Design a protein around this ligand. Structure first.
Ligand SMILES: Nc1ncnc2c1ncn2[C@@H]1O[C@H](CSCC[C@H](N)C(=O)O)[C@@H](O)[C@H]1O
Ligand SMILES: Nc1ncnc2c1ncn2[C@@H]1O[C@H](CSCC[C@H](N)C(=O)O)[C@@H](O)[C@H]1O
Ligand SMILES: O=C(O)C1=CO[C@@H](O[C@@H]2O[C@H](CO)[C@@H](O)[C@H](O)[C@H]2O)[C@@H]2C(CO)=CC[C@H]12
Ligand SMILES: [Mg+2]
Ligand SMILES: [Mg+2]
Lengths: 317, 346
């Protein structure tokens, strides 16, 4: 989780800035300030992220004439099979918030109406709720037979994947809109695609590009294999956010070492082994050799500017 | 220490039917508490917030919480402008509680938002004035620790002969009650901070009726049977006598008089009702096998930690079976204390 750690550390200045500039409940500040992390995993990364947020809100608190905030309540959300035991045992002893964990998909409601002041999600929202049905349909123009993911090179495949990403993100936004009070902030970080690029020439995309042929090395089951993820462009996020209506997009930007074949192969395996198993020795031996001969490509042909930062603000009334 | 986690045959989840009976018997008192004592006048919340202290791994906690939610919702719909829009239910236990198992057991089809909170209920767990109803079912007999005096070989309170406070040794009882008074008062102070004015605190715990001692309650007598099994294991050279002498559980079973004394001294709550429930298993014959597994699911951890088990519990099972008629004829069954408290308006 060290790369994801870096995203949070890179985003800290932005989070601090976002809260300093955009968090303002006017005459209606809470005594209990409530924060939720959507897709928290098992730590430590969620603890650093929540710590940075609490620190920023504390500064905000001190900045007001009559500091309104008495305490903090932080909620850690992940899927029901997340290892919450480990998360709980890892909670920082010295912290300034009451803590709770919440099981469930973040594509549903997870919290009471107008109970949240700030919502966060770091490196989670690229995970779709499912594979789009259309890319599985042998008779669709969107049949994604040649690849494990949306490369972005195929217009109809891209249509189906984006349709799913839009549906899922819009579901998330609707849910968070109900849970956040008016003026509440929603901070989102996820891997994406910078202007002038496509998924396939980002690191995550090209990794999938190397895997697809490895599987080809049952053909039928390879043709029907797809992953439930999407890496959006800034234009795509703006379309979804604008169509949604409940938030203003206060900021959307991309935040800023040699490729390690061995380490990457181990990390890639840990993330995707399950998906492959459900749909490994022989395969990841072939993948490790393929990453090996792709070092200079990762070093000098792949876009590394992929960490999207999104600050949204819950519209009033 | 938490109960046996997971969902196997030795687990708390699989062996806590007696405790579920306590919640079952409590249901009618919960309905009366809501009907009679839950009243926020013209400041009812839109989000009704409930916390369960000592929830374990389910399914009992989900049962207790569903009964409360339904009662409150019935009340809600009986108001001309039903004020409550949603429910938020918090599940609290120690940090080593098997929350993974708890969460896999939580109903995915339900009418309340849910969260779990790790930590000792002798500390603050929630923001100030955030809760409308606090629940604790068969948890508040657990002390924050064994009293220091009973571990002290030079003290008159040295509890060398028993695993718990029987009530028969005066110095041991003094040491244990002092700890209970301190602990429960600390629990009530913390809950007083967390509950809004007029909020309810609903409690059940194992206690002692008038004219009895811990010794001749089910909880006490099961410990009376454990002590000699440990002594026997020491005689047979599996553990040391020294280790037996030093073994004590952090538990106290109070009388109503004791509870009233602690409550009255605390001052943050009015005592709206204190009564002994009629347990639904009251008229059933003792079941040694099932009681053995119940008892194991609770105390296995304590024994493991102190002594560093299968053979012990085989011996224990034998003693339970042998003592069937004692449980059936000589043990007080009027032992499930129900307590309703109401946070005073500050
Ligand atoms: N629909 C969903 N609902 C809740 N959690 C989800 C989810 N889809 C994915 N996740 C979780 O999101 C996490 C992505 S990994 C990111 C962990 C952490 N936020 C960090 O920055 O390091 C995983 O723990 C995954 O289980
Ligand atoms: N200091 C403390 N803080 C929180 N939970 C505690 C505690 N001491 C004991 N407990 C918990 O209280 C529970 C007692 S068993 C009762 C479980 C449940 N309410 C039921 O009705 O079955 C255990 O889960 C134990 O771990
Ligand atoms: O939930 C618990 O912690 C327990 C739950 O139930 C307790 O035992 C029960 O204690 C009850 C109270 O005396 C009896 O009526 C029951 O027969 C008996 O099974 C366990 C016990 C035995 O020494 C002490 C406390 C423990
Ligand atoms: Mg495919
Ligand atoms: Mg002893």
């Amino acid at each position: 989780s060290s790369y994801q750690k870096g995203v949070i550390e890179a985003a800290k200045a932005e989070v601090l800035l976002a809260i300093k500039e955009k968090l303002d409940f006017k005459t209606d500040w809470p005594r209990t300030f409530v924060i939720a992390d959507y897709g928290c995993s098992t730590g430590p990364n969620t603890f650093f992220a929540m710590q940075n947020i609490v620190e920023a809100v504390e500064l905000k608190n001190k900045s007001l004439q009559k500091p309104p905030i008495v305490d903090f309540h932080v909620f850690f959300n992940d899927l029901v099979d997340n290892d919450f035991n480990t998360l709980f045992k890892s909670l920082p002893s010295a912290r300034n918030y009451f803590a709770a964990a919440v099981p469930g998909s973040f594509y549903e409601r997870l919290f009471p109406k107008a109970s949240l002041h700030l919502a966060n999600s770091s490196y989670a929202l690229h995970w779709l709720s499912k594979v789009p049905e259309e890319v599985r349909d042998q008779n669709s123009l969107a049949w994604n037979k040649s690849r494990t993911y949306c490369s972005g090179t195929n217009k109809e495949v891209t249509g189906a994947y984006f349709a799913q990403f839009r549906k899922d993100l819009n579901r998330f936004l609707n849910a968070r809109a109900e849970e956040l009070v008016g003026g509440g902030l929603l901070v989102i970080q996820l891997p994406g695609v910078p202007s002038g690029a496509l998924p396939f020439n980002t690191g995550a995309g090209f990794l999938q590009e190397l895997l697809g042929p490895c599987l080809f090395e049952s053909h039928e089951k390879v043709y029907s294999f797809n992953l439930p993820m999407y890496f959006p462009s800034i234009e795509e996020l703006n379309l979804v956010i604008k169509g949604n209506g409940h938030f203003t997009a206060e900021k959307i930007k991309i935040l800023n070492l040699l490729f390690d074949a061995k380490m990457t192969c181990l990390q890639f395996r840990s993330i995707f082994e399950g998906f492959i198993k459900d749909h490994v020795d022989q395969l990841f031996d072939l993948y490790a050799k393929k990453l090996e001969e792709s070092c200079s490509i990762f070093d000098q042909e792949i876009r590394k500017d992929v960490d999207l930062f999104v600050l949204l603000k819950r519209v009033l009334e």
